[PDB]
Amino acid sequence: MAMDHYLDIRLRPDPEFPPAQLMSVLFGKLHQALVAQGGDRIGVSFPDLDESRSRLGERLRIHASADDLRALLARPWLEGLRDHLQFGEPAVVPHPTPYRQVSRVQAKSNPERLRRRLMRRHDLSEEEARKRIPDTVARALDLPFVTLRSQSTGQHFRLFIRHGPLQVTAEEGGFTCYGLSKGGFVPWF
Amino acid sequence: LSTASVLAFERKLDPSDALMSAGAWAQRDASQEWPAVTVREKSQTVDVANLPSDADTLKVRFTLRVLGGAGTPSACNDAAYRDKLLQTVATYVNDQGFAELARRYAHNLANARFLWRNRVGAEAVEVRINHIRQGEVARAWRFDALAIGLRDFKADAELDALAELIASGLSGSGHVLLEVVAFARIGDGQEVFPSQELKTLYSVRDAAAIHSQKIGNALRTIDTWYPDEDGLGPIAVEPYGSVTSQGKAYRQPKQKLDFYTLLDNWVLRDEAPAVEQQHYVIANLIRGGVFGE
Amino acid sequence: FLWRNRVGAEAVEVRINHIRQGEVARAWRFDALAIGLRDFKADAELDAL
């Protein structure tokens, strides 16, 4: 509903990295060279998203502000690797604005982190917390929640997103220092 | 006349392994004693390569022999197919030089495509190339791999000098030995990608490294005349021209862009193809491999 | 005997020692690239060997 300043990002297909790898590289570059000095308005929804085939990211769409894009796209934390993807263009916000509140948050993924929490500041049974981790115990994003991770943990990327309901309503909220929404986002369409 | 039942071409453009080390930027003028990137272990067990605490610059060094004699097979049953192939490749060499294919190989040396995922998001990458005739640099080139593109092919003066050197090496006019150094910029203690073994990272005597067939794949990435789409740029020169990461395969024997079909028509039946398709055929002959039925 | 290890090399030489006791009785030294591979041409130390 409030996707006035709109932009897109298309990572071109090449044999030097996967589409999820290119999306993770673009997301890490945006999180390092967009919320480096801070900021308020950052909206990064799936501009070419399809959450039915289990693919969380294969296209980028930015719904940000005017001054947030006039000074948030001219740094070396964004440029440099522009030989795979391309630049963007500005577009106005139409009357059709679905309230797709896109966020940048986490989800429950610890199958033994409850035991660490009980040992640190809980005083709970750590053996039952370790043995209480079945396949039907973890409840994370089973839809395409693309987790662009780093080279610190061997475990693969689970869900890290705050998606909203796509309808004909309006829902906007406060953007964080990483390109998300803390109660809503800009439009998507 | 028929096809030779056994063909075998020795490869040209024979690279050595990539000895990855690490250092600090603007000390590249004395980058001989830089410490190597050591493969270590952390967590199940994985192998992880990193940078030192006071380092932010990768160094990837290898050498490259350019051989020449790019038409003669190393094993051939027929004596009519063999000299028919020799005179066909001699027609290719005398009507135009190697300078087109060698220009594209010098472009793949000019940028840093032998850096695979240690290039993505780099601040500055410089590809230094020296010419070695004895133990002394006979000609020194310096580049900038982010200025020179990856999906298009352009012109320069030093790139044309390097392409002339590669074209003299591929024809048999001399002996060319080049050493290649690619400095980079990643960050103060970030992660570098070596090549994985059958996880296990590839190594030598206490140094992470890259396989030589990987750098060879990054050098035979030439052909733009798969005419379907230029959004992917160029791909690797190989028959039934295919990408395993893409999973698809263009240049099929469905249409007649195949190496085998073009080679059969241009050697046996004297059907001279377009100039770009014969550039592809001579690039496959420079690649080498096991041919024949 | 250098089969592929001489194909495209800078300089190849073959030096040959004659061993009587644990001692070189007569030494030679050649240039394997100057000496051809298609013809058998004469030389002084080649005739000695």
UniProtKB/Swiss-Prot annotation, chain A:
GO terms for biological process: defense response to virus; maintenance of CRISPR repeat elements. GO terms for molecular function: endonuclease activity; RNA binding. InterPro entries: CRISPR-assoc_prot_Csy4, CRISPR-Cas6/Csy4_sf. Its EC number is 3.1.-.-. The record marks 150 as: Substrate binding. Changing residue 51 to A: No biofilm formation upon phage infection, no crRNA formed. It comes from the Bacteria. It holds the Pfam family Cas_Csy4. Metal-ion independent. CRISPR (clustered regularly interspaced short palindromic repeat) is an adaptive immune system that provides protection against mobile genetic elements (viruses, transposable elements and conjugative plasmids). CRISPR clusters contain sequences complementary to antecedent mobile elements and target invading nucleic acids. CRISPR clusters are transcribed and processed into CRISPR RNA (crRNA). Processes pre-crRNA into individual crRNA units. Absolutely required for crRNA production or stability. NCBIfam families: cas_Csy4 (TIGR02563). Part of the Csy ribonucleoprotein complex with a probable stoichiometry of Csy1(1),Csy2(1),Csy3(6),Cas6/Csy4(1)-crRNA(1). A Csy3(6),Cas6/Csy4(1)-crRNA(1) subcomplex is also formed. Belongs to the CRISPR-associated endoribonuclease Cas6 family. Cas6f/Csy4, subtype I-F/Ypest subfamily. This is CRISPR-associated endonuclease Cas6/Csy4. It comes from Pseudomonas aeruginosa (strain UCBPP-PA14). The lineage of its organism: Bacteria, Pseudomonadati, Pseudomonadota, Gammaproteobacteria, Pseudomonadales.
Swiss-Prot record, chain B:
The keyword Hydrolase does not apply. Disruption phenotype: Mutants lose phage DMS3 infection-dependent inhibition of biofilm formation while there is normal biofilm formation in the absence of phage infection. Decreased production of crRNA in the presence or absence of phage. Disruption of the entire Y.pestis-subtype CRISPR region disrupts crRNA production but does not alter phage resistance (possibly OLNs PA14_33350 to PA14_33310, and the flanking CRISPR loci), indicating this CRISPR is not involved in phage resistance. Keywords: Antiviral defense. NCBIfam families: cas_Csy3 (TIGR02566). CRISPR (clustered regularly interspaced short palindromic repeat) is an adaptive immune system that provides protection against mobile genetic elements (viruses, transposable elements and conjugative plasmids). CRISPR clusters contain sequences complementary to antecedent mobile elements and target invading nucleic acids. CRISPR clusters are transcribed and processed into CRISPR RNA (crRNA). Cas3 and Cascade participate in CRISPR interference, the third stage of CRISPR immunity (Potential). Involved in crRNA production or stability. In this bacteria, Y.pestis-subtype CRISPRs do not confer resistance to phage DMS3 or MP22, but instead are required for DMS3 infection-dependent inhibition of biofilm formation and possibly motility. This is CRISPR-associated protein Csy3. It comes from Pseudomonas aeruginosa (strain UCBPP-PA14). The lineage of its organism: Bacteria, Pseudomonadati, Pseudomonadota, Gammaproteobacteria, Pseudomonadales.
Curated annotation (Swiss-Prot), chain C:
Disruption phenotype: Mutants lose phage DMS3 infection-dependent inhibition of biofilm formation while there is normal biofilm formation in the absence of phage infection. Decreased production of crRNA in the presence or absence of phage. Disruption of the entire Y.pestis-subtype CRISPR region disrupts crRNA production but does not alter phage resistance (possibly OLNs PA14_33350 to PA14_33310, and the flanking CRISPR loci), indicating this CRISPR is not involved in phage resistance. CRISPR (clustered regularly interspaced short palindromic repeat) is an adaptive immune system that provides protection against mobile genetic elements (viruses, transposable elements and conjugative plasmids). CRISPR clusters contain sequences complementary to antecedent mobile elements and target invading nucleic acids. CRISPR clusters are transcribed and processed into CRISPR RNA (crRNA). Cas3 and Cascade participate in CRISPR interference, the third stage of CRISPR immunity (Potential). Involved in crRNA production or stability. Part of the Csy ribonucleoprotein complex with a probable stoichiometry of Csy1(1),Csy2(1),Csy3(6),Cas6/Csy4(1)-crRNA(1). A Csy3(6),Cas6/Csy4(1)-crRNA(1) subcomplex is also formed. Belongs to the CRISPR-associated Csy3 family. In this bacteria, Y.pestis-subtype CRISPRs do not confer resistance to phage DMS3 or MP22, but instead are required for DMS3 infection-dependent inhibition of biofilm formation and possibly motility. This is CRISPR-associated protein Csy3. The chain holds residues 147 to 195 of 342 of the full protein.
